[PDB]
């Protein structure tokens, strides 16, 4: 079949009534930029594995989406991030859960896949593994956005 990418930024009660067109266009612009990067990479012969890794890295970086920068807040006003990546060729997979000090969880998941004999790492052990492989330690504060903090406050007000 012909090379192809699909992406998502989350399913749920996305309210047309609560949205302006300018708000909608910010999401459309972000989705279109990321799917266009993936299409160009596929056209240029990049692997499906590298394409999904880069697309999810960009969705993490985008503050509009609940992954990486723009992560929702827990009950404790913390961030806990999780990611997985799987290669359909080898059936290798890598995953992290409960990480707070890694900017791009999908890149930590890819590190588990490519630079360990393991599939899944959690918490501080996952972080220490990633740091030992030279991944940068960040403050969990880097993920915080006013939009998501106000959503936490609205849920408990």
């Amino acid at each position: 079949g012909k090379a192809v990418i699909a992406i998502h930024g989350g399913a749920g009660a996305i309210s047309r009534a609560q949205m302006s067109l300018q708000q909608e266009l910010r999401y459309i612009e972000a989705l279109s930029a990321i799917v266009e990067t993936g299409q160009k990479m596929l056209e240029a012969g990049e692997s499906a594995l590298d394409v999904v890794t880069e697309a999810v890295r960009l969705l993490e970086e985008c503050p509009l989406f609940n992954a990486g920068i723009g992560a929702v807040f827990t009950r404790d006003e913390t961030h806990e991030l999780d990611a997985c990546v799987m290669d359909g060729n080898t059936l290798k997979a890598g995953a992290v859960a409960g990480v707070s000090h890694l900017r791009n969880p999908v890149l930590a998941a890819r590190l588990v896949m490519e630079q360990s004999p393991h599939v899944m790492m959690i918490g501080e052990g996952a972080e220490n593994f990633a740091f030992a492989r030279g991944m940068e330690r960040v403050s969990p504060e880097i993920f915080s956005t006013s939009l998501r903090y106000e959503q936490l406050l609205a849920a408990r007000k």
Partner: protein, 135 residues
């Protein structure tokens, strides 16, 4: 939650999923996103899947692998497997959400049972499509 699925020019499938979880989450809760076969699955023999929704139901129903198994063992088309999982099985267990999927034949599906799913797709060298709401 965010995700991506792809089929490359070599015929390889891959999937990835990433999340911050839920607003006001109980610390230590794990949803489907990091769990192979729940929120993320890829197999060149069948499909690449990334999910988003009510994590617990996607785990209990192994949603991503269930798409693969319905196609591989049940002989369902991608469209038939997506309808069965997203529109029948997940709702029956009280789940909401959707997923994105690409099969080994290059068919793409973006099913969801919610009001919206932020989504986009495009074939290599072709024009991309974006969506938020239901068609």
């Amino acid at each position: 939650t965010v995700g991506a699925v792809a089929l490359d020019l070599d015929g390889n499938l891959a999937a990835a999923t990433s999340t911050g979880g839920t607003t006001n989450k109980l610390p230590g809760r794990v949803g489907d996103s990091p769990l192979v076969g729940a929120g993320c699955y890829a197999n060149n023999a069948s499909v690449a899947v990334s999910c988003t929704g009510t994590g617990e139901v996607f785990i209990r129903a192994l949603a991503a692998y269930d798409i693969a198994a319905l196609m591989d063992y049940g002989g369902l088309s991608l469209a038939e497997a997506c309808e069965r999982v997203v529109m029948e099985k997940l709702p029956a267990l009280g789940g909401s959400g959707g997923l994105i999927a690409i099969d080994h034949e290059g068919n793409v599906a973006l099913p969801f049972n919610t009001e919206g799913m932020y989504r986009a797709w495009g074939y290599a060298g072709d024009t991309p499509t974006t969506g938020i709401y239901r068609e």
